[PDB]
């Protein structure tokens, strides 16, 4: 087409979606990871994770307001990945990299799994 | 912080939100612009427009599944702006610029209003 494009638009949209999340505005699901609860927008979760895309395109699961993750999932790992979904920034540290990579494999976040594998390879 | 950042994340999220819109997945509002209807996600509309941010943060309006816009709003102008919200690309043409600018002023999309004003100034 003959369109013009605003370079910062996608980043500005994501920043505003994170502001809605902070202020608990129009959050429509609670993700339970053992004793912890995380509120989020189903659309953002689906746009970032192959697992959430599969869950919320299912005719029965799309209607649930609570999703319980596998008990092996670490809540800190999930928290770091949820922050990544809403900000593009990943708080990857020596003390959390194994939990983050395991969580990203479960959530089907291929780009995160890729950077974790590279950081682990560099340490070996 | 000591975060790493994935450059293409925000653009990839927006591309996936537009794919959900195309496939009518988890759309939760219909915007009516005279005889036309447009389905969208309330969160994307709020992240892009000062008018939708004000509507969906209102305790009564946040619950509506249908929003009727002012009859003076042109449906083509709205369609072009909705496509911009989900893609960052604005289909601005000599034949639609006045309707697009009027619609962006009504929706409170300051960056769009800014580019329309500049393109109009260049023609004078």
């Amino acid at each position: 087409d003959s369109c013009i494009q605003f370079t910062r638009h996608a980043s500005d949209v994501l920043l505003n979606l994170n502001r809605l999340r902070s202020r608990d505005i129009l959050t429509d699901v609670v993700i339970v990871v053992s004793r912890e609860q995380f509120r989020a927008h189903k659309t953002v979760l689906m746009a970032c994770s192959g697992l959430f895309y599969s869950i919320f395109t299912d005719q029965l699961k799309c209607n649930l307001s609570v999703i319980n993750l596998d008990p092996e999932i670490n809540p800190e790992g999930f928290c770091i990945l949820l922050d990544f979904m809403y900000t593009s920034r990943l708080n990857l540290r020596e003390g959390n990299i194994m939990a983050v990579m395991a969580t990203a494999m479960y959530l089907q976040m291929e780009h995160v799994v890729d950077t974790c594998r590279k950081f682990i390879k560099a340490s070996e | 912080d000591s975060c790493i950042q994935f450059t293409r994340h925000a653009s990839d999220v927006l591309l996936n939100l537009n794919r959900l819109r195309s496939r009518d997945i988890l759309t939760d509002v219909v915007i009516v612009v005279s005889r036309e209807q447009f389905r969208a996600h309330k969160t994307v509309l709020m992240a892009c427009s000062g008018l939708f941010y004000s509507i969906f943060t209102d305790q009564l309006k946040c619950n509506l599944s249908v929003i009727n816009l002012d009859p003076e709003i042109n449906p083509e102008g709205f369609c072009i702006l909705l496509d911009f919200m989900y893609t960052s690309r604005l289909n601005l043409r000599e034949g639609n610029i006045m309707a697009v600018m009027a619609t962006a002023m009504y929706l409170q999309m300051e960056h769009v209003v800014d580019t329309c004003r500049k393109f109009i100034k260049a023609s004078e």
């Binding site: 369109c3 013009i4 494009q5 605003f6 370079t7 | 690309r89 604005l90 580019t115």
Partner: peptide, 4 residues
């Protein structure tokens, strides 16, 4: 704004 840019030409994409």
């Amino acid at each position: 704004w840019v030409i994409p």
